[PDB]
Design an enzyme around this catalytic site. Structure first.
Site, PDB file in Angstrom:
ATOM      1  N   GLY B 264      18.254  58.862  20.730  1.00 10.00           N
ATOM      2  CA  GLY B 264      19.202  59.781  20.138  1.00 10.00           C
ATOM      3  C   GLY B 264      19.142  61.145  20.795  1.00 10.00           C
ATOM      4  O   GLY B 264      18.925  61.245  21.995  1.00 10.00           O
ATOM      5  N   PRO B 267      17.177  67.423  20.318  1.00  8.10           N
ATOM      6  CA  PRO B 267      16.678  68.284  19.232  1.00  8.10           C
ATOM      7  C   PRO B 267      15.998  67.536  18.075  1.00  8.10           C
ATOM      8  O   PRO B 267      15.023  68.033  17.482  1.00  8.10           O
ATOM      9  CB  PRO B 267      17.951  68.980  18.724  1.00  8.10           C
ATOM     10  CG  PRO B 267      18.948  68.848  19.859  1.00  8.10           C
ATOM     11  CD  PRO B 267      18.634  67.556  20.520  1.00  8.10           C
ATOM     12  N   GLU B 292      14.068  58.246  24.087  1.00 10.31           N
ATOM     13  CA  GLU B 292      15.154  58.166  25.055  1.00 10.31           C
ATOM     14  C   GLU B 292      16.242  59.074  24.517  1.00 10.31           C
ATOM     15  O   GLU B 292      16.810  58.815  23.456  1.00 10.31           O
ATOM     16  CB  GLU B 292      15.642  56.721  25.239  1.00 10.31           C
ATOM     17  N   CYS B 326      24.597  57.347  27.062  1.00  7.92           N
ATOM     18  CA  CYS B 326      23.600  58.259  27.603  1.00  7.92           C
ATOM     19  C   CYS B 326      23.721  58.325  29.132  1.00  7.92           C
ATOM     20  O   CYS B 326      23.428  59.357  29.745  1.00  7.92           O
ATOM     21  CB  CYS B 326      22.190  57.805  27.178  1.00  7.92           C
ATOM     22  SG  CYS B 326      22.010  57.473  25.384  1.00  7.92           S
TER      23      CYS B 326
END
Lengths: 541, 541
Positions: B264, B267, B292, B326
């Site tokens: 995800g 932060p 990841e 991603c």
């Protein structure tokens, strides 16, 4: 088309016997004499520049603390950052140098340590850390040499682990070093550990700031000089002794930190871990922390045990090098049936144990503990063993710091299996015994597993093969290195990869094939050889 | 002595073509119809008990947000702790079950996914996450099936990595699971990723609390049910959807946490890392965090590139599944000499791109973005592309959330290579282009490397072989998955192990042979077969 793949045939470095008249014993005695009365001046080394700061420190011989064996200094914030900047500027070329060229440096250093430099490195470990001949030999020679050779073998053979290729594409894995610098923080108890903490990451294409233990400086710098002569380029490893906290503060504040390779105490490791976390936002990547911390290790004895093996194995594990090993046995569990025999043999053999000067007298079993702070901590424990009602000293109990930090090997019996002395790590020659009822051995197995916070090493002595299989299951997580009818010390590289979980650390198993993986960040490269084609798919037409 | 060992040969799952009249296309259309207008009720599963809480939530089809495809609920602190206690009580027996028996479960689940359950799992991924046929196929079938099979092969073969034995001792390595529970936190974009986040640790002898993405619930639960039917025992994986922060707060507060397997945002990962550090003192061992996170990925074009490959490759990478990967390309660097040709071919092909309902119309290239929060964020970027002076929209720019969260594929040209849209991750179908002067291509290589915080994927298009070798060096750390004349998406298990460093995560390379090592804590066992001997050494006589 083809895959070409390389291997390396390595053997463990043979441990010399050092008997009367042997060449190694003559060599070692000359190396010891060449050290008596001399004090080495040891600078910080950044790149190739020898650097001195105003913060001068001394390393003294533990068994004769009036002899200063080395004079060195602490890097300041300024020097540490100069060292970081310079290491970073040397990294890309080093990371790009093929693994075979890097391995070659460590293979040559291993060969230097094995032959010409052996006696020198043994002698500096004996004199600077207080090790006897055989402890220096299995450490500063055999284990350090084995780390260099076996890690080189493992790194070379890792290159051959390559992904599957399928036409019209070829795939390859490139084992990159971490992007940044690695901080290596080594402890006093093993000369080999400093070598591997800084050496293994360097081998894998990293640049390293090495803070060696102040109480092992003499031998650590000898390791460093050997690596440099073996061919290690400048700024690949910076030799930067320093105040612990200042070093920790500086490196966990650099945006360039990509790893910490730590051996030592749990609290210091947790502290570094918390510092890195507090600063997570500033790092260019996520720093990898590896930590080998202490243990509260056990020898568990079943009624079927060979009593002589229990006795000699426990004496060696508890008391060799003054019990100053992460793996040393400090809690022994004995069946009521066997206690009278074992107590008697232990007490008889204890009385034959000679503690003294390891350079002047090779009949010395072990010597002084490392430093005054350690000596003090151990005395407070000795006082605790008299004061406590649950505790009685069965042997030893005296200590004398007039000449060296000398502590007599001590054997304490506990009536309480949860006493602080059965749980807290002493790092001195103090063996705690708990005698358990034969009928209650299954529950006592549970006590071993449940009593402390640690999971480093442990041993079971039993001739009953079914009881061994049972304890092996029960104690599965009580010890990362588990021994069956052997002492809980003396892990050999490539044979017992070493480390454990729970509070004892991250268990990356140095001495094994997987350890080096922590120090690489692999890249996968896919090359396609035929033109791509329509962006649409057939099922869509 | 001698031991019975074993190995596993496996093959990638073939990607079906789904053309008119093919069996797979008929199966899939029946599975889609069996879903229209139906809403699955999905409980938390702890052990074998289906559990409902008062905190009911819905998952809606992204291209038709009026259709609620699933109703599920959030675990509360109470339920999460019940799930932890129950997982922990099942762990020892599971860790003790041989790796071949555990592998067998995942092999059977892979075979279920491959045949009988394929259409069902494709259909739930298409409907619940908004994937087109081929995107669901390479993800929910091929990649998930490959993770199960390849990780099983790797775990089985890991057992064969054993240390050296030297008489009178035999050494063995036991690959223990981590002691405690692992928390697996998966994202919406891949069904396969949930499977592997929870599946790989479970395979290695761990017990897992899996929090699946609310927007992938339908297919995630279908994966969960398949694993259970394939033979996964109760309390090995707990299915526990929950509010993100509450889940994160609960598991980082358990003394029993031994790992977090996260995919995800950066932060959220950093936050979990900080929580674990704040609580270090309470954990029984040091928790392993694997993360990841995202990327800001590039296609870099040299003047020698095949223009057609650049065009179709970039369109696929930027816009497949709405650019919600991603690995998706979102920054394209083009030479001035090639720009006119590439701009024209891009604009022409862009106009042929059909966006719509992927179940009703298989001619759909991609569909709506996942949810409203994502749709909003993307619109704010589109408004930023008009507003910014350095930026002009070359194509698309419209979005319409009346029926689904539909965004037109958008192409933006930037005059400023350091503009926020060249640096910040959008996770939508938005491609930024920077045109560079041919004479300045060496310095533009440096810009690629230096512009963002990420290091996930990257591609170079060049027919000039010497320029490829050069960019490969320069970009070594700009991409963990690096592609030469291919798109920056579509990593296949066992062929391109996937992940990258810098801000993109911890780079443990799922899809490779080393990933599983993060999820074991090895124990070494040394058994000695002959009696020990004197505690003294010969050199001491």
């Amino acid at each position: 088309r083809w895959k070409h793949t390389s291997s390396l045939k390595v053997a463990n470095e043979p441990v010399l016997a050092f008997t009367q008249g042997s060449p190694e014993r003559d060599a070692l005695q000359k190396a010891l004499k060449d050290l008596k009365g001399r004090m080495e001046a040891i600078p910080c080394v950044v790149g190739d520049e020898e650097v001195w700061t105003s913060d001068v420190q001394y390393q003294v011989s533990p068994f004769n603390h009036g002899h200063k064996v080395a004079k060195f200094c602490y890097a300041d914030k300024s020097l540490l950052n100069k060292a970081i900047e310079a290491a970073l500027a040397a990294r890309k070329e080093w990371d790009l140098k093929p693994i075979a060229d890097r391995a070659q440096i460590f293979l040559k250093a291993a060969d230097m340590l094995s032959g010409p430099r052996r006696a020198e490195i043994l002698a500096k470990t004996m004199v600077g850390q207080g090790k006897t001949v055989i402890q220096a030999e299995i450490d500063a020679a055999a284990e350090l040499i084995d780390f260099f050779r076996f890690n080189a073998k493992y790194a070379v053979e890792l290159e051959g682990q390559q992904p599957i290729s399928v036409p019209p594409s070829t795939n390859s894995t490139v084992y990159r070093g971490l992007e940044g610098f690695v901080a290596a923080i080594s402890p006093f108890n093993f000369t080999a550990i400093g070598g591997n903490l800084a050496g293994a990451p360097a081998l894998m294409g990293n640049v390293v700031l090495w803070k060696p233990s102040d109480t092992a400086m003499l031998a650590s710098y000898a390791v460093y000089r050997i690596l440099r002569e073996a061919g290690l380029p400048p700024n690949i490893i910076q030799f930067v002794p320093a105040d612990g906290p200042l070093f920790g503060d500086t490196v966990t504040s650099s945006e360039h930190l990509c790893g910490i390779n730590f051996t030592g105490s749990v609290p210091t490791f947790k502290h570094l871990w918390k510092q890195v976390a507090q600063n997570l936002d500033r790092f260019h990547t996520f720093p990898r922390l590896a930590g080998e911390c202490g243990g509260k290790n056990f020898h568990f004895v079943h009624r079927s045990a060979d009593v002589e093996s229990v006795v000699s194995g426990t004496l060696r594990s508890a008391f060799e090098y003054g019990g100053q090993k992460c793996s040393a046995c400090s809690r022994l569990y004995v069946p009521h049936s066997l206690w009278p025999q074992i107590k008697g043999r232990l007490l008889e053999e204890h009385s034959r144990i000679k503690v003294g000067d390891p350079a002047e007298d090779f009949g010395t079993f072990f010597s002084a503990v490392i430093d005054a702070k350690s000596f003090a901590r151990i005395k407070k424990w000795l006082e605790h063993a008299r004061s406590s009602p649950s505790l009685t000293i069965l042997a030893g109990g005296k200590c004398d710091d007039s000449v060296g930090y000398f502590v007599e090997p001590c054997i304490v019996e506990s009536k309480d299996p949860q006493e602080p002395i059965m749980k807290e790590e002493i790092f001195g020659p103090v063996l705690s015994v708990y005698v358990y009822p034969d009928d209650k051995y299954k529950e006592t197995l549970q006590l071993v597993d449940s009593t402390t916070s640690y999971g480093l090493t442990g041993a079971v002595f039993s001739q009953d093969k079914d009881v061994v299989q049972e304890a092996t299951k029960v104690l599965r997580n009580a010890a990362g290195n588990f021994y069956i009818n052997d002492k809980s010390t003396g892990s050999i590289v490539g044979q017992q990869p070493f480390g454990g979980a729970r509070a004892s650390g991250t268990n990356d198993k140095p001495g094994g094939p997987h350890y080096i993986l922590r120090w690489t960040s692999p890249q996968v490269i896919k090359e396609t050889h035929k033109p791509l084609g329509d962006w649409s798919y057939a099922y869509m037409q």
